[PDB]
Amino acid sequence: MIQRTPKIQVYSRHPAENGKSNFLNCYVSGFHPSDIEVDLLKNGERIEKVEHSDLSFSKDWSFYLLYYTEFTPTEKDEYACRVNHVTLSQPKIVKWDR
Amino acid sequence: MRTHSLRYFRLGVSDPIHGVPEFISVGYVDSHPITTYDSVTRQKEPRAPWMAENLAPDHWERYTQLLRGWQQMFKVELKRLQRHYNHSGSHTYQRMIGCELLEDGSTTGFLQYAYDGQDFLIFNKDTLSWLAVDNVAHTIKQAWEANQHELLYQKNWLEEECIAWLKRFLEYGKDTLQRTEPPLVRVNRKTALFCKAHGFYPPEIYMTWMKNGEEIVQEIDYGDILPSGDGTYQAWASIELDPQSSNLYSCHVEHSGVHMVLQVP
Amino acid sequence: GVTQTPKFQVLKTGQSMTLQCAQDMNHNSMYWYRQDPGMGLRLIYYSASEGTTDKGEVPNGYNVSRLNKREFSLRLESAAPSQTSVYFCASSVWTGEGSGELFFGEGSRLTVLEDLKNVFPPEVAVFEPSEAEISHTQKATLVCLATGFYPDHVELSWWVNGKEVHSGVCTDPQPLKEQPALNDSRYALSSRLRVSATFWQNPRNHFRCQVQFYGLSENDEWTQDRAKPVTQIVSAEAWGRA
Amino acid sequence: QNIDQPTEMTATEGAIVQINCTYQTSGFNGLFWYQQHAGEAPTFLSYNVLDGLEEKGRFSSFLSRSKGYSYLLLKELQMKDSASYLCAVKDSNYQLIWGAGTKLIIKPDIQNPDPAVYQLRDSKSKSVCLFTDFDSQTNVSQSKDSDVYITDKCVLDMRSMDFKSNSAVAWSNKDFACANAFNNSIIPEDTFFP
Ligand SMILES: *[C@@H](C)CN1C(=O)CN(C[C@H](O)[C@H](O)[C@H](O)CO)c2[nH]c(=O)[nH]c(=O)c21
Numbered sequence: 001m002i003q004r005t006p007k008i009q010v011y012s013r014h015p016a017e018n019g020k021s022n023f024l025n026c027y028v029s030g031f032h033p034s035d036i037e038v039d040l041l042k043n044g045e046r047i048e049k050v051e052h053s054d055l056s057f058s059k060d061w062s063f064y065l066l067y068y069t070e071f072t073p074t075e076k077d078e079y080a081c082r083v084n085h086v087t088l089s090q091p092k093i094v095k096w097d098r
Numbered sequence: 099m100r101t102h103s104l105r106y107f108r109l110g111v112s113d114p115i116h117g118v119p120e121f122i123s124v125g126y127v128d129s130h131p132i133t134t135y136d137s138v139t140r141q142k143e144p145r146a147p148w149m150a151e152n153l154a155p156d157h158w159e160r161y162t163q164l165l166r167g168w169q170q171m172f173k174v175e176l177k178r179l180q181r182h183y184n185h186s187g188s189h190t191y192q193r194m195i196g197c198e199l200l201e202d203g204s205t206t207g208f209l210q211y212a213y214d215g216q217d218f219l220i221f222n223k224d225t226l227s228w229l230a231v232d233n234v235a236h237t238i239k240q241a242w243e244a245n246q247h248e249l250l251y252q253k254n255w256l257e258e259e260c261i262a263w264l265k266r267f268l269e270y271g272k273d274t275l276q277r278t279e280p281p282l283v284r285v286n287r288k289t290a291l292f293c294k295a296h297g298f299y300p301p302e303i304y305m306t307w308m309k310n311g312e313e314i315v316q317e318i319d320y321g322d323i324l325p326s327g328d329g330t331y332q333a334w335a336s337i338e339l340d341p342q343s344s345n346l347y348s349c350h351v352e353h354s355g356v357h358m359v360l361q362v363p
Numbered sequence: 364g365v366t367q368t369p370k371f372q373v374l375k376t377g378q379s380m381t382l383q384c385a386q387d388m389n390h391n392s393m394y395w396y397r398q399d400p401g402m403g404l405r406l407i408y409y410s411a412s413e414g415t416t417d418k419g420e421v422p423n424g425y426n427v428s429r430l431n432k433r434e435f436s437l438r439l440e441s442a443a444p445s446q447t448s449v450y451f452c453a454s455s456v457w458t459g460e461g462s463g464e465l466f467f468g469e470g471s472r473l474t475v476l477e478d479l480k481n482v483f484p485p486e487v488a489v490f491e492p493s494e495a496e497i498s499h500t501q502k503a504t505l506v507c508l509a510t511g512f513y514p515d516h517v518e519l520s521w522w523v524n525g526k527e528v529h530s531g532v533c534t535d536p537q538p539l540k541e542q543p544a545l546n547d548s549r550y551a552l553s554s555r556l557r558v559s560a561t562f563w564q565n566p567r568n569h570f571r572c573q574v575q576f577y578g579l580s581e582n583d584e585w586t587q588d589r590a591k592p593v594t595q596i597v598s599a600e601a602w603g604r605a
Numbered sequence: 606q607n608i609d610q611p612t613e614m615t616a617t618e619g620a621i622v623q624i625n626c627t628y629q630t631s632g633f634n635g636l637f638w639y640q641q642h643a644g645e646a647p648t649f650l651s652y653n654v655l656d657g658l659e660e661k662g663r664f665s666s667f668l669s670r671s672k673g674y675s676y677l678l679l680k681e682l683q684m685k686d687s688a689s690y691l692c693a694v695k696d697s698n699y700q701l702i703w704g705a706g707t708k709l710i711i712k713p714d715i716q717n718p719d720p721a722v723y724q725l726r727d728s729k730s731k732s733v734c735l736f737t738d739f740d741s742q743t744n745v746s747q748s749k750d751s752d753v754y755i756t757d758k759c760v761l762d763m764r765s766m767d768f769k770s771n772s773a774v775a776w777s778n779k780d781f782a783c784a785n786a787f788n789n790s791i792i793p794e795d796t797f798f799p
Contacts, residue, residue, distance in 0.1 A: 001189075001214040013326045014296065027324050032215040033190050034109065035118055054145070056131065057107040057124060061192050061212040068327045159417070160698050164459045167391060167412035171457055247652050251461025251635055254654045258670070259632055259697060365646075403608065403691065403703035451646070459699045461635050464649040490733055493723030495799040502763075506725055506733055506774055533759040533772060536643045543751070553756045553774040555735075557763060601728050 004062055005087040006031030010080060010096040012073070021072045024096065026081035029064035037084045038067045041093070043077055073098075099276065100300065100354065103128055104264035105196030110172045112180060113188035121169040126196075127267045127275055129301055135165045148271040179213055182234045190214050197260035199268075207256030223253040278354045279330055285349055285360055289339055290319075293349035293360070296332035301325070304352040307337040310345055364388070367452040367468030371516045371577035371594075373482060374442040374475045382437040382471050384452035393435035394453040394465070395419070395427060404451070410435050411458040442475045449473075474514040479583065481547055482592040484576045485512035489599040492563055503563030507554040507572035507599065511541060514550070516577035521556045522598075524569050531557040566603040573598045606630050608704030610692045615710040616682055617741070624677045624690050624707050632697020636668055638677045639691040641706070647691055651677065679709075684762060684769070687711045712741040713760050713769045720796040724783045733776035734783040739793060745773045746789040753777040755787070 006028045013023035028038055034055055040047040052067040067081070084091035105126045114120040117138075124145070125133035131145040142162045144150040176191040183189075191213060198206040209221035219239060220229040226249040230236035243249065268275055281298030285291060293305060307318050314337075321334040337347065349360045367384040374380055386393065395407045406419030408427040416427050424446060426438045435454075439446060452468040476482070488510075492503035509517060519534045520527055538552035554572065562568060578592040585591040609627045616622035628636065635654040641647035653659060653668035653675060665678040677690055692704040719738040726732055736745070748755050755775040762769050775786045784798050 001185075001216070004215065009322070009324060011324065011332075013328055023327055025324070025327050029322075033111065033188070035115055054124075054131070054134065055122070057109070057126075057192075057194070059105075059194070061194075061215045061217075066325055066327060157698070160700070163409075163411045163415060163417045164699065166415045167458050170391060170412045245462060247462030247654070248460065251654045254670075255461065255634065259634065262632065262697070401705065403693075403705045405703075406701075461654055461695065462652050464637065464652065465639075465647075465701075467646040467648070469646055470644070488731075489728050490725035491728055493725050493735065493799075496721070496723045496735075496737070499721065499797075500719065500738065502768075504723070504735060504737055504772070506735055508731075508733070508774075508776065530765060531761050531763040533761040535756050535759065537757070539754065539756065541754075551754065555737075555759060555761055555772050555774070557761050557770070559766070599728065 003087045004030055004032040006036060006083055006085050008081055008083050008092060008094040010094050012096070012098070013068075016073045016098045018073050018075055021070065023068055024071050024079055026067040026083075026094075027064070028067070028081075028083055030058065030060075030062045031064075031085055031087070032062050033086065034063050035086060036063075036065060037091075038065065039082045040067060040069050041080045041082055042071075044080075099201060100302075101198060101200050102264060102268055102275065103196060103198045104260055104267065105194055108168070108172055108191075108193045110176045110191035111188055112176055112190075121172055123165055123168070127264065127271065130271070130275060132267060132271075133161075135162070135169075137169055140166060140169075146271060146274075148274065149267075152270040179234065179238075182237065183213070195256070195260075197256055197264055199261055199264055205257065205261050207253075207260060209252060209256060221252060221256075223256050226250065226253065280356065281351065281353050283349065283351050283358060283360060285362065287339075288336075289341075290336045291339055291347060291349075291362065292334055292336050293351075294332070294334040295351060295353075296326065297328075297330040298332075298353055299330050300354060301331040302353075303331070303333055305333060305335045306350050307335065308348045308350055365452060365454055365466050365468040367450075367471055369471060370469060371472050372474075372580070373479065373514065373516070373578060373583075374439070374473060375479055376442055376444060376475055376477050378439075378442040378475075380439040380442055380473070382450055382452070383434070384436065384468055385434045386454040386466070387433075388454065388456075388466065389432070390454040390456050390466070391432070392455045392458045392463075393429070394455075395425075395435065395437045396451045396453060397421065397448040398451060398470075399448050407437065407450075409458075439473075442473075444475050444477070447473055447475045472516065474516065476514070479579060479585075479592075480587070481513055482578050483511055483513050483549065484578060484592050484595055485509035485517060485552075485574045485597050487572055487574045487597045487599040489570070489572050489601045491601055491604065497560045497563065501560045503558055503560050505556045505558075505570060505572075505601070507556070507574075509538075509552045509574045509597070511549040511551070512574075512576060513548075517550075517552060518575040518577075519552060519554050520573040520575070521554070522571040522573050523556075523558075525571075528556070563603055564605070568603040569600065570602070571598050571600040606696065606702060608692055608694060608702055610690075610704045610707045612705070613708045613710065615712060617712045618682055618684060618714045620682050622679050622682060622709065624679075624692075624709065626675045626677070626692035626704060628673055628675070628692070628694045628702070628704075630694050630696045630702055633670060634695035634697065634699060636675050637691075637693040637695075637701075638666055639693065640688050641691055642688040645688075650690070682711050684711050684713060684760065713771065715739070715741045715769070715771065718793070720793040722783050722786060722796060722798050731776050731778055732781075733774055734786045735772060735774055736787055736792075737772040738770045739796070741771060743771075743791065743793060745787065748775070749789050750777075750779075752779065753781060 009027045050069040080095040109122045119136040119138045121137035123135045135142040193211045195209045211219045228239040230239040279299045281295040283295045319336045323333040347362045351358045391412045393410045396404045410416045410429040413432045450471045453465040455463045490506045534554040538550040540548035542548040577594045638650040639647040651666035658667045663680040689706045689708045691706045718740040
């Protein structure tokens with residue numbers, strides 16, 4: 001009954017270049033159980049139109065998800081992912097260090 | 099070709115949250131979801147366009163009925179485990195079945211179950227026996243091994259039916275499952291050396307660094323293969339630049355039968 | 364085991380009819396089949412698990428209801444002659460198993476007719492053993508005949524001294540027709556019971572041939588003067604001789 | 606998607622019979638054999654899903670998935686084995702496909718043939734003739750005149766005496782006599798008419 005905490009990676013579909021519309025990806029992987037909650041933060045603000053893949057299963061009985069949303073990067077903006085899990089008391093934030 | 103796999107997962111939760119279904123069953127070919135069913139929709143549906151384009155509605159009708167009974171089967175199984183374990187609350191029952199078709203034509207098959215994400219029972223199609231991880235599993239193994247007929251049927255499905263299914267899907271989604279998009283590989287500086295690759299399918303790739311012609315696995319920081327979300331994948335591997343010295347480092351990448359080398363000035 | 368009712372039924376074209384089936388075995392899957400001469404079993408409807416049903420191979424004119432984990436009822440909202448058949452209810456532990464074997468009910472025989480006008484209970488007569496046979500073989504062979512009955516809804520039994528006997532008995536499996544030309548022909552069926560000539564010569568021995576006939580039910584309207592051919596037993600007897 | 610097995614097979618008491626079955630299905634998930642007596646519920650006999658012979662008592666079942674072929678083998682045949690044997694195959698969708706079935710007929714081993722025809726008189730005076738005790742080799746053909754009736758071969762077992770005999774019944778209303786009864790059938794020459 002040992003739980004596994006999620007692994008949160010923040011990155012972009014293609015290499016980041018300011019002024020060109022890209023995609024920002026939050027890949028939450030290797031967590032257990034399947035109840036998870038993920039949001040994408042624009043300078044700390046939630047992003048409404050955020051899409052995600054359906055839940056998916058791993059050989060090692062864990063699960064993984066991909067939350068992604070369209071965006072255009074700017075030097076002014078900092079982007080991070082917020083994930084809450086049963087294994088987390090404080091929701092965790094992961095910044096996008098490009 | 100390459101190696102291809104067909105897998106069928108089942109998930110059960112004893113105390114579902116509002117919305118979080120108490121049964122989900124998803125089918126994969128390699129890494130692509132092909133089918134989905136859950137206790138809420140109570141019907142089986144494709145997750146890939148080429149699955150629906152090629153399977154008649156009577157197929158989905160038929161397996162929808164089967165999955166409904168299988169969903170019931172799973173609910174009962176999880177109850178007995180929790181009773182056996184003297185467990186209460188929410189608990190997870192999982193089961194993965196599938197097969198592999200290798201490049202050389204050899205096949206593999208597997209079947210296993212897991213309780214609370216823990217390896218619980220593993221099938222062995224080559225000895226017609228079950229591997230129990232603890233006493234509760236052994237008690238289940240004692241019963242399951244009794245019906246010797248089911249073990250035999252298990253072996254046949256894993257070895258023959260599964261492969262036949264998988265081959266069928268390979269042709270159905272040939273233009274997607276059997277495609278290849280080569281990776282774009284660049285080298286960065288950050289101070290270490292980042293050898294990044296993006297936009298490549300299939301997702302399996304090998305990357306490593308070489309010190310003048312000798313690999314150093316210990317001193318290489320590999321990154322996971324992540325999905326870019328457009329159907330391709332990306333990954334990277336970093337290495338520390340010895341400042342007091344100066345060697346000739348080089349990035350090596352293997353992907354879908356192509357070996358590629360970049361050299362640092 | 365698996366209990367399905369009724370064993371026999373007679374229906375007029377356009378009637379409604381329901382077959383009961385229950386299983387004591389705590390199975391999840393239940394099936395309704397129709398078995399017809401010439402071809403194998405054909406599934407009508409099936410219930411892969413509680414609270415779920417689906418059409419089989421021939422679901423036209425039929426409907427089913429998974430009442431609970433135990434009962435799976437089959438309905439004929441309007442009977443047709445093309446529906447005359449033997450219906451078997453089966454259950455298995457689960458569907459999708461490999462070795463999951465089926466468990467069948469006793470079977471239900473239906474005969475759908477344009478009108479009940481041709482339903483006639485059998486006439487049963489018993490013929491004593493030939494004198495020649497007794498002194499030649501030391502054994503007495505009896506013969507029983509059921510004549511002019513329709514439809515083929517009979518069960519023939521032998522009753523020596525009030526107890527059903529099975530040893531030394533042979534009943535025709537297929538009852539032949541009295542007038543084979545017509546398709547509405549009456550059926551006739553014969554049987555044999557053989558015992559030691561010592562048994563036959565004892566006059567304190569009572570032999571009875573019983574024909575159980577399944578005809579009209581309790582809520583079947585009957586009009587014509589000739590008596591209602593309700594489900595009934597027709598017997599003929601005989602005693603021992605010199 | 607079809608299943609093929611013979612219609613009728615006749616084998617002698619105490620001998621061996623091998624009922625064949627060939628199947629062509631989209632996928633395969635096991636091959637079943639069911640026994641079903643006259644007017645009785647079918648019952649499970651054997652399941653095969655991997656190639657090879659499986660033996661259990663007198664019955665044995667063989668599967669060759671590659672050849673799409675199987676057979677039920679019944680050893681030391683008994684009179685009680687007369688029934689229909691149903692060959693059924695599960696397909697890739699677990700849908701169970703039933704063959705037409707095979708009707709098995711066990712000829713008794715008539716030890717001491719005593720062919721003869723006897724007349725029995727009505728207890729409440731039609732009249733009938735009984736062909737009994739003949740060899741299992743003989744067969745009985747239908748009558749030559751409509752309004753004259755004959756039944757098929759019938760085998761009774763006097764289990765107490767360990768004695769079995771064949772029999773058939775013929776009757777009519779007409780004119781009709783026991784000597785003219787079974788003229789359409791090849792009757793043993795030494796048959797006795799009193
Ligand atoms: C939907 C068409 C996807 N399937 C399958 O096609 C078949 N399948 C296999 C099944 O579990 C075994 O062959 C059988 O129970 C013997 O071990 C399957 N299984 C799942 O658990 N989930 C699925 O979605 C499918």
